Design a protein around this nucleic acid. Structure first.
Lengths: 78, 110, 93, 136, 56
RNA sequence: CUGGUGACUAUAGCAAGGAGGUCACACCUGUUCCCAUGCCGAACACAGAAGUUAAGCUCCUUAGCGACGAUGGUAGUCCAACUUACGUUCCGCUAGAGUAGAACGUUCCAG
RNA sequence: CUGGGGCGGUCGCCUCCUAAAAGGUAACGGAGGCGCUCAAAGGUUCCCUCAGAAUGGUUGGAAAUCAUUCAUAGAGUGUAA
RNA sequence: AUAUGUUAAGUGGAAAAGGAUGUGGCGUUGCCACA
RNA sequence: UUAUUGGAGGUAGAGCACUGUUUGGACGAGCGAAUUCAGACAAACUCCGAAUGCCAAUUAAUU
């Protein structure tokens, strides 16, 4: 009366790492994902693991890229 | 029948991502046709056109070269040194290739 | 037979709607031409009587805002468990 | 015996059983219907028992419409077993009936004989019923 | 200077979220009173603990 | 209005009935040449008579299909009493329906 | 380890559900995969656009190939999700 | 204790499908007779 | 801890545009599941979508 289920994998902590309107550094991670849920806006790169990081300092803002898509940008202070 | 102009704009979007502003600016745009060849220099972020000069013999090949020297002087009046070339969707050969080599020799490095 | 109706102002709380459905009244809305979605109240037993006379697709001489307006019944919600209506819509012509 | 020919997963979580019915609150196909005023599970075996007892009273009068269907399967472990060591095995197929859903529909008969047919079908089901008609 | 809040019911058996709202108003003991000036920020606090305090 | 090039959840699209013209975009003649088809100068790119606005393009008209959609009521629900299924208060869907809707449009060219 | 022990089963890694719209979250709860392959199946600059349905054509259904028309992906993406 | 109604079962102070001229409250509607 | 503002995230509910399931009609495509008109179901379905909760501002009071 044994079973064949019961195995799972370790959880990979994904999602947003910085809020909206927050000040970030020049190498901070903005989003972990599998695929492209959020596209890289201006002043934001894209890693080899589809990670979204910021290139410069400033405030981070989430925008909309057309219909049923969105992006995230970084603007310098002042 | 197939429209050559409407399928041309599709290829312009595939190249407009890598060079416009992200690579360099201002952007030199080329618009070819079966009767005349045009050109103009645009700003990406501001969204304004700086200079403009176009062709309007030999079915627009030497006149395609003529735009290269005319734009280069219009690019030297206001003063710009570094530029980025936008093919516009056409292959870099022939009429459009002659327009680039003309502006390059006239003190306008790409 | 004519729908003698009164008005209700402000935002009616959830309790007063339950108290309205028990005293024998039914809420309604007139959203025709120029009426500006005026919320209106109406009796229950006097609505079933008039629609039997004229019909489901007949006009009504409803009195709202102390004036006569010719309106018809567009759609209404019905609770099947207690065999009675809960809401009426009036599309003025 | 109503049961789907194939399902994606044989073992599923049991339904909620609490709340109110989504649809099927009015009579659309037939004329005289049968409402429900209590929540319970209607096994497929209880449907064939009520359908035979209903269409028999109407030898060849009219048509009957079954409005529900046993999509969800339930399981039960064998006899004399402790807890755990996996899940059970499929034993039947059930539906979820909430207050307001029409169970059966009858047309092609008179009003006096529709009440007697839908009465014998209500004693076979574990819920309470109410004779309803088409809405004006 | 126009609102006075006194504590009627006790905080035993209440969620910890509601215990921080009473501490943010200055009500330590039972039947204690404070004087505060009305504003959108102070009004929303007693609206959270309405069943524990009464306002005059 | 004629073009070039951008920014904006199809209120920008589909679908149909009409008016367009050799200055401008095209339709079109030919492979000498630059280059080209795992065969085809049809599409890529050179060289260009006449002819047609038939088609693309541009423009008017229409609510057939898509897309935008309040007010009211309902479902659900935070907190709070009764208590286990019912009151009170706050927030407030989906669907559906009266309406929007046959785009806006910054900067450079030729009349 | 174990709804007392023995017998049976299982022990590391990966993907989804259970999980209560951030993240995290158990049970001998419900379903699958891995212990490798690629010398181009990597890099780069150019150029293309699908599976199906339908009228015929050497006729096995008009989809073993060949042509026209529709086709927001119903195809593909070395290998589970 | 006060005002205003309900309930005859000791209900309160233990249980369901189902059965019934127990008794109140608000309605629907056809004969204006049933005996 | 409240007030105001902004954003990330698809549960409750609902729905049939996707995958799977399903009842009765019309209609030659095989004649309700290849098309059509009505009506239903879903932890591993989603064209849609709350209430709460969470991260922030260096925005205001109270502590």
């Amino acid at each position: 009366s044994s079973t064949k289920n019961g195995r799972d994998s370790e959880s990979k902590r994904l999602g947003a790492k910085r809020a909206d309107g927050q000040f970030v550094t020049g190498g901070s991670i903005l989003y972990r994902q599998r695929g492209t849920k959020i596209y890289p806006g201006e002043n934001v790169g894209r890693g080899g693991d589809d990670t979204l990081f910021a290139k410069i300092d400033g405030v981070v803002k989430f925008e909309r890229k057309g219909r049923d898509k969105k992006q995230v940008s970084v603007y310098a202070v002042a | 029948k197939i429209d050559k102009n409407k399928v041309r704009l599709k290829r312009h979007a595939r190249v407009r991502t890598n060079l416009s502003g992200t690579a360099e600016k201002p952007r030199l745009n080329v618009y070819r046709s079966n009767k005349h060849i045009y050109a103009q220099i645009i700003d990406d972020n501001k969204g304004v056109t700086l200079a403009q000069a176009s062709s309007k013999t030999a079915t627009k090949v030497e006149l395609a070269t003529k735009v290269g020297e005319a734009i280069a002087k219009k690019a030297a009046d206001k003063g710009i040194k570094e530029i980025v070339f936008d093919r516009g969707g056409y292959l870099y050969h022939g009429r459009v290739k002659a327009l680039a080599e003309a502006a390059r020799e006239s003190g306008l490095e790409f | 037979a004519s729908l003698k109706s009164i008005i209700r102002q402000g935002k009616q709380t959830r309790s007063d709607l339950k108290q309205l459905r028990k005293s024998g009244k039914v809420p309604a809305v007139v959203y025709g031409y120029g009426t500006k979605n005026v919320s209106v109240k109406v009796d229950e037993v006097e609505f079933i009587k008039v629609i039997r006379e004229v019909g489901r697709n007949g006009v009504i001489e409803l009195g709202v805002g102390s004036k006569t307006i010719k309106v018809m019944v567009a759609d209404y919600q019905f609770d099947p468990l207690k065999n009675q209506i809960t809401h009426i819509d009036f599309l003025a012509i | 015996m109503l049961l789907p020919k194939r399902v994606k997963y044989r073992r599923q979580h049991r339904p909620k059983t609490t709340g109110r019915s989504k649809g099927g609150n009015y009579v659309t196909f037939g004329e005289f219907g049968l409402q429900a005023t209590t929540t319970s599970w209607i096994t497929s075996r209880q449907i064939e028992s009520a359908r035979i007892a209903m269409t028999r009273y109407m030898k060849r009068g009219g048509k009957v419409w079954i409005k529900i269907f046993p999509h969800t399967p339930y399981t039960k472990k064998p006899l004399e077993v402790r807890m755990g060591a996996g899940k059970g095995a499929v034993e039947g197929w059930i539906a979820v009936v909430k207050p307001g859903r029409i169970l059966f529909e009858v047309a092609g008969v008179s009003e006096e004989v529709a009440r007697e047919a839908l009465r014998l079908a209500s004693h076979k089901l574990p819920v309470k019923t109410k004779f309803v008609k088409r809405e004006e | 200077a126009k609102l006075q809040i006194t504590l009627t019911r006790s905080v035993i058996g209440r969620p910890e979220t509601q215990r921080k709202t009473v501490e943010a108003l200055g009500l330590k003991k039972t039947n204690s009173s404070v004087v505060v000036e009305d504003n959108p920020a102070i009004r929303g606090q007693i609206n959270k603990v309405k069943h524990l305090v009464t306002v005059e």
